[PDB]
Each structure stands twice: as structure tokens, then as C-alpha cells.
């Protein structure tokens, strides 16, 4: 009873009518019958319905319809590229059936609210994916499918047509093909790969222009801030060597015992840290 | 290579599974399969094979030894450690597991760990030999106090004259003659008049003989003998012989008395 | 001043013995000592199960306990009244189960039931802007002339960690 859901599926209305079938469909993964839920998300929306059984969601920690993580809204291949691939799960036939069975007993014996072993891992995060995690609901995802009479030029329902009248996606784009099983296991997922390419460009971690340099060239200081903000932020890292301050261009230089600590302060800092409700931007030299 | 090797693996692998499914048990099939994957250094597969075999028959001690061995061969110390713990937990009576477990820890250098294991082992009140091995373990390091402590527990767990004698002898070997004497006193005190015989009393006599307390030896020999059963007959004879020897170490009066 | 684990005022990163300063994600499951005593090596066996469920492992468990007298409150049959309670609760629970089984033999649901949900995503832009939502659950009507939808026959191969057992001459051989 009650599905497991994204906030993005469930709807942008707080009031929702949602129907239930006892054994509605096989799950497209572990292939068992399971309680299925439909509901209307919104005014122009599509009537989504749960695609996979609740168990294999608890297993990989995901929405039932979307298969996007609960916290990050990221396809599974991504958050695995983000932490731990070694979760695994047999893809192969009768194994899948077997492992699902056992893991279904293991889950039965848990407190109920926890994605099994992954959650022991799931706490430690934020490497990148937080910064590539999506922020707001994305409703373009629930729109009705593309009317396929109209996309041949004919559709004779006129304005009534609940489907959507517009140009489809060119089958050329590798982002088209998108199997379900595939998106689930984290194989060759085009979306996930795209997000990976997007991850790399994040100006961030390579640093190291020069050896031993712990000099921090800090842009976007501002004249509200004091140094004491700086120190009481940065004593976490280690033994400071010193701090140079310039308020004429509002840039603050810093120096630490080891370069390692400076890299760190970059990492922890870059395009993340803000104090005095004002962004504190960092660069090398 | 790339594909050609692969096909080979399917034929073997599939065959192994077929054999297992046909016979179910007959764990020589399980083991051979495990060994083959081990040889290809696919040890994650190997682990699963061993666990599956254990599900079929957890009592089979060869299986467990092969499993732990496999982990050790691949330097997977902590896996092996886990496995050993399981083996002794589920089949505590199997001494082979305990001997190997302590040996492994000793090789790793973890004396404390090994001691801990042996203390667990001793809770099962095992067998004379196990206790000896624990004591010897201690004696590979100086640790004489530890050894003596173990003996103190051991001679009560298996209160056999012989063990008491052995304990005393241990003290003698390390020159704690004061304590050795005390141990003999304790032994005779404990056993009491009710049951004691030849061996212990002889050994005590020998001890005092070596301590050069000849008069005392005679006192002990006589007084303790008269205090108890005497004659059994064989034991008595042995004792008499010992006494004679001690004496040696007009005076053939009992030669005539025994004959007459 | 020390700069080593050996040796708040310091204003230094110091980690005194062995608190880890870099990610490891180590497998090891914490060794434990309980109250006065023992490294809880029996924790191996429980591992799969919950703390609640019992499992014998130490030698002490195996060793005999004596006597207990002609009788003591210690061994007795819960009582009349405990039995009545147990029996009654059992009876009702079984009956529920049986009725479900019996549903097959005897081939109608009308409840509208509302639920109130708290999400776990929140963030104030996720809903219109509500910490909760409400969902009216309705059971879908089944077509009575619909055949069994899907096929159950498929078959997949079949325990607990074994409890410890705690239980020859040449000529005999």
C-alpha cells in the first residue's frame, strides 16, 4: 500500500486521487505481479503508473515510476559513478529470480525504511552529484506522448486530441533509445553518460599550477566580511602558514603548511562555500 | 585469447553446474569447481561456490578447510579470519579448525589474537593435547607465569594424577623447586587417602631424592604409604623397588623376611 | 606542539591515536565489548538476524545446569490465563489467514480511504509549497469475467546459519 515516489511524479497539486490494483502488472525487472498505482499528476498530464515493484526500488533506492534516486533525482548509473558500483545484482535470469527472492526476505527483516546495504554506504556523498543534482521539479516529464497521427500529418480529433502536437525527437540522437532494464542496471545509459560529460567540465579539482604553492587567490570577498570569518572557517584544515588580505580589489590570499590542505580548501570550497550570506570565490595565484 | 579462452570457461563452468545439479551433494563436485575458479583467479566466484557448498552441507570439515585455505593463498587475511571464526563457532568440536586458526594468527604475528582464540577454545574443556598446545604456545615466548596459570586450570579440568605430575615436572624443568614441592603437596592433599597410588607418590619421592632429602624421602615413603592402601600389588611392588633404589643411593633383613 | 598522535587550545588538526583522516570506506564491523567483558566474537553468527532473535554460540550455553528442586516458579506452564490469552489471539489470527485462503473457493470492496503523506524531498518548490500532501486511495474495480492475468508456474531453487553442534579404535574400524 502506497507507492514509493519522486516528488516530481506525484504531482504539483497537493490534492490527489490515486487508484490501486492488487496485482496489476508484472514489474519490468524482477517480473512479478505487484500492486500498481495510477493517479493524474496535473491538468495536462498523462496518468502515470508505477513501473516497478516496490522491492526492487528499495533495492536500488528509487522512485517506482521514474527510477531516479529519491534524494538526487539522478539515473542510477550516475549515482553509482558517484559512489559504489559494487552493489550489483544479478542480471541473468534464474539468478535474478533467486537473488530477488532472498533479498526480499532480507528486506522483510529490516526496519522497513532503508534501502538495504546501500544505505550503509548512502550517507557519504556530495562529491559531485550534489552539484549536478537537480534542484526543482521537472514537469516537462509528465507531458502526454506525441500524437502519432499528427506526426504523420493526419490527426482527425482536432483540438480535442489529448496527445501532444509537435515535432518529435530525431531518431539520430543517441539519447533516444533508452531501454528500461538498461536504465535500471546502469549500462550504457545515454542520459547518464551525458551527465557524466557534464560532470567533467565543472571547473574544480585539477589545480596544481605550481609545486608547494598553498597561496589562495580569493575573488569576490566583499567589504562586509572580516578575516575572522576566514580563520574560523579554515582552522578545520590544519596549520595555517599565513593569510594575506587585500580589500582594494577585495581579493584575499592564503597560505597553509602543506599544498594538500590548499587543494582541500579548494575542493571543499570551490563554487560551494558561502559565509556572511555572500559567495566566497577561490582561484590559484 | 579474448573470445577463445572465454568459450572454454563456458564449457567447464556449465559442466560444473550440471554436475552439481545432478548430484546436489557429493561435495567433490563443489570443491573441484571452486578449485578451478580459484586457479583462474576469479576468487569472488570461488567464494560464492564455497558458500553454496556450505549451504548444502555445513558440517563437512574438508570443505571449510579448502575455503579458508583458498582465502589465505590469495593473501585475503581478513576473509580468512572471518571464515575461521565461523568454522569454530558452528563446529566447535572440530580441533583441526582450532589448531589452524591459532597457527594462522601466530604466523601473522598476532600473539594477543592467538591468545584470545585459545582462551575461547579452552572454554570447551577440550582434550589433553589441546591444553598442551596452549601451554607450548605460551612457552615459545618466555611467558612462564602464563603457562603456570594455564596448568593451574588444566589440572582441575582433567584431574588426572599424570597431569598433576606433569605440572610439577614443568616447575622442576624451570627450577621452581619450592613451587614444585608445593604442587606435590597440593596433589596429595587433593587426592587424599581415598584414592592415591604409585605414580604420584613415586614421582614425589624422586623429587625429594633429587633435592637430597633422603631421610625426608623415607618419612614420606613410609608415612604416606601406611596412611593409605598398600600391599594394587604391582603398584606396591614398584614403590618398594623405588624405595630400595633410594636406600642404595645386615641391611638385607627384608630379603629374608620376603622369602620366609 | 606535538605534531604526533603520541602526545582544543592547539588550534591544530591533531588526531591523537587512530581516528582516520582520509576516506577508507572500510568493511570492518565494529568489534565490541559489553559492559565488563568480552570481545563479542559471537556477533558473527547474529549478523544476518536482528538482535531480538536468539542464537547460541558460547561454550557456556552448552554446559549443564543442575537440579532446580522438586519445583520452582522457574518452570511452570504460563498459567491458565496466559494460555487463554495466547489461544484466543492465535485463534483470531489464524481465522483471518484461513478466510483469505478460502477466498478462492468463494469467488466486493467499497472503501474510500485517505492518506496524508510527508515527502522527504521538501524544499518549498517541490510541491506548490506544502510540507504534506493528501491522497485519496481507491481500490480499482476488477472485471469479474477476467481470467487469471499472469502465469505463476515458474520454479526457482530453494537456510539459517547452522546452530553449533555441542554434542574410533582401529579394531572397531
Amino acid at each position: 500500500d502506497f507507492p514509493i515516489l519522486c516528488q516530481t511524479c506525484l504531482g504539483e497539486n497537493p490534492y490527489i486521487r490515486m487508484t490501486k490494483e492488487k496485482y496489476g502488472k508484472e514489474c519490468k525487472i524482477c517480473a512479478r505481479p505487484f500492486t500498481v498505482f495510477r493517479w493524474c499528476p496535473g491538468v495536462r498530464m498523462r496518468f502515470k503508473k508505477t513501473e516497478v515493484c516496490q522491492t526492487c526500488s528499495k533495492l536500488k533506492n528509487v522512485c517506482q515510476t521514474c527510477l531516479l534516486d529519491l534524494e538526487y533525482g539522478l539515473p542510477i548509473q550516475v549515482r553509482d559513478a558517484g559512489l559504489s558500483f559494487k552493489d550489483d545484482m544479478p542480471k541473468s535470469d534464474v539468478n535474478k529470480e533467486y537473488y530477488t527472492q532472498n533479498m526480499e526476505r532480507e528486506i522483510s527483516n529490516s526496519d522497513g525504511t532503508r534501502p538495504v546495504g546501500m544505505l550503509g554506504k548512502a550517507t557519504s556523498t556530495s562529491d559531485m552529484l550534489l552539484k549536478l543534482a537537480r534542484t526543482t521539479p521537472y514537469y516537462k516529464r509528465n507531458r502526454p506522448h506525441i500524437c502519432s497521427f499528427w506526426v504523420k500529418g493526419e490527426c482527425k480529433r482536432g483540438e480535442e486530441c489529448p496527445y501532444r502536437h509537435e515535432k518529435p525527437t530525431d531518431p539520430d540522437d543517441p539519447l533516444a533509445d533508452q531501454n528500461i532494464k538498461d536504465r535500471y542496471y546502469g549500462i550504457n545509459d545515454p542520459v547518464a553518460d551525458k551527465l557524466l560529460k557534464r560532470a567533467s567540465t565543472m571547473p574544480r579539482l585539477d589545480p596544481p599550477e605550481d609545486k608547494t604553492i598553498t597561496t589562495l587567490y580569493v575573488g569576490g570577498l566583499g567589504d562586509t566580511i572580516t578575516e575572522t570569518d576566514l580563520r574560523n572557517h579554515f582552522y578545520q584544515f590544519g596549520e595555517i602558514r599565513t593569510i594575506t588580505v587585500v580589500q582594494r580589489q577585495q581579493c584575499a590570499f592564503i597560505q597553509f603548511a602543506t599544498r594538500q590542505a590548499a587543494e582541500v580548501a579548494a575542493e571543499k570550497s570551490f563554487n560551494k562555500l558561502i559565509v556572511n550570506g555572500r559567495r566566497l570565490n577561490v582561484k590559484w595565484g | 585469447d579474448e573470445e577463445e579462452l572465454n568459450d572454454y570457461k563456458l564449457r567447464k563452468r556449465k559442466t560444473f553446474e550440471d554436475n552439481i545439479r545432478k548430484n546436489r551433494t557429493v561435495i567433490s563436485n563443489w570443491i573441484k569447481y571452486a578449485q578451478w575458479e580459484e586457479s583462474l583467479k576469479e576468487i569472488q566466484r570461488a567464494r560464492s561456490i564455497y558458500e553454496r557448498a556450505l549451504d548444502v552441507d555445513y558440517r563437512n570439515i574438508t570443505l571449510w578447510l579448502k575455503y579458508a585455505e583458498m582465502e589465505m593463498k590469495n593473501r585475503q587475511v581478513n576473509h580468512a579470519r572471518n571464515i575461521w571464526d565461523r568454522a569454530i563457532t558452528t563446529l566447535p568440536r572440530v580441533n583441526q579448525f582450532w589448531y589452524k586458526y591459532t597457527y594462522m594468527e601466530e604466523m601473522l604475528g598476532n600473539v594477543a589474537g592467538a591468545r584470545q582464540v585459545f582462551e575461547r577454545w579452552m572454554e570447551w574443556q577440550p582434550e589433553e593435547q589441546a591444553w598442551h598446545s596452549y601451554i607450548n604456545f605460551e612457552l615459545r615466548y618466555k611467558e612462564v607465569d602464563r603457562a603456570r596459570t594455564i596448568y593451574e586450570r588444566f589440572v582441575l579440568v582433567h584431574p588426572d594424577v599424570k597431569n598433576w605430575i606433569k605440572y610439577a615436572r614443568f616447575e622442576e624443568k624451570h627450577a621452581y623447586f619450592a613451587h614444585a614441592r608445593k604442587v606435590y603437596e597440593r596433589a596429595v592433599e587433593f587426592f587424599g587417602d581415598e584414592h592415591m597410588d604409585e605414580h604420584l607418590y613415586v614421582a614425589f619421592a624422586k623429587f625429594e631424592e633429587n633435592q637430597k632429602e633422603f631421610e625426608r624421602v623415607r618419612v614420606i615413603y613410609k608415612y604416606a604409604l601406611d596412611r593409605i592402601s598398600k600391599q594394587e600389588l604391582f603398584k606396591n611392588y614398584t614403590i618398594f623397588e623405588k624405595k630400595f633404589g633410594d636406600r642404595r643411593g645386615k641391611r638385607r633383613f627384608q630379603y629374608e623376611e620376603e622369602v620366609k | 606542539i606535538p605534531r604526533l598522535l603520541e602526545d582544543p587550545e592547539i588550534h591544530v588538526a591533531q588526531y591523537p591515536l587512530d581516528m582516520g583522516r582520509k576516506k577508507k570506506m572500510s568493511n570492518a564491523l565494529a568489534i565490541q565489548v559489553d559492559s565488563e567483558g568480552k570481545i563479542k566474537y559471537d556477533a558473527i553468527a547474529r549478523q544476518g538476524q536482528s538482535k531480538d532473535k536468539v542464537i547460541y554460540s558460547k561454550y557456556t550455553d552448552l554446559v549443564p545446569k543442575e537440579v532446580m528442586n522438586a519445583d520452582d516458579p522457574d518452570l511452570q506452564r504460563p498459567d491458565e490465563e496466559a494460555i487463554k490469552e495466547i489461544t484466543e489471539k492465535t485463534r483470531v489470527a489464524l481465522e483471518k489467514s484461513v478466510s483469505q485462503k478460502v477466498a478462492a473457493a468463494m469467488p466486493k470492496l467499497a472503501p474510500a480511504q485517505y492518506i496524508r503523506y510527508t515527502p522527504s524531498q521538501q524544499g518549498v518548490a517541490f510541491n506548490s509549497g506544502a510540507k504534506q500532501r493528501v491522497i485519496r486511495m481507491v481500490e480499482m474495480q476488477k472485471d469479474p469475467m477476467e481470467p487469471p492475468r499472469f502465469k505463476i508456474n515458474k520454479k526457482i531453487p530453494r537456510e539459517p546459519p547452522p546452530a553449533p553442534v555441542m554434542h574410533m579404535t582401529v579394531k572397531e574400524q
Binding site: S92, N95 | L40, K41, H79 | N27
Partner: peptide, 29 residues
């Protein structure tokens, strides 16, 4: 058919015990 040569038939990842198995990996043939 692929329950063998593609994907490890049924997998039991070994249970993890008081020691570190993170580091360990093995060589090819």
C-alpha cells in the same frame, strides 16, 4: 542462456567481517 556466460548466475557477495576487503582485487589470466 545468458544466465551463465553473461551475468553471474546467482550471486552471493560474501558477508563482510571485522576486516578490510575493500582493497583486494585479483589478476587476469
Amino acid at each position: 542462456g545468458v544466465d551463465y556466460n553473461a551475468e553471474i548466475p546467482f550471486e552471493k557477495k560474501p558477508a563482510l567481517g571485522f576486516y578490510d576487503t575493500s582493497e583486494e582485487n585479483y589478476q587476469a589470466l
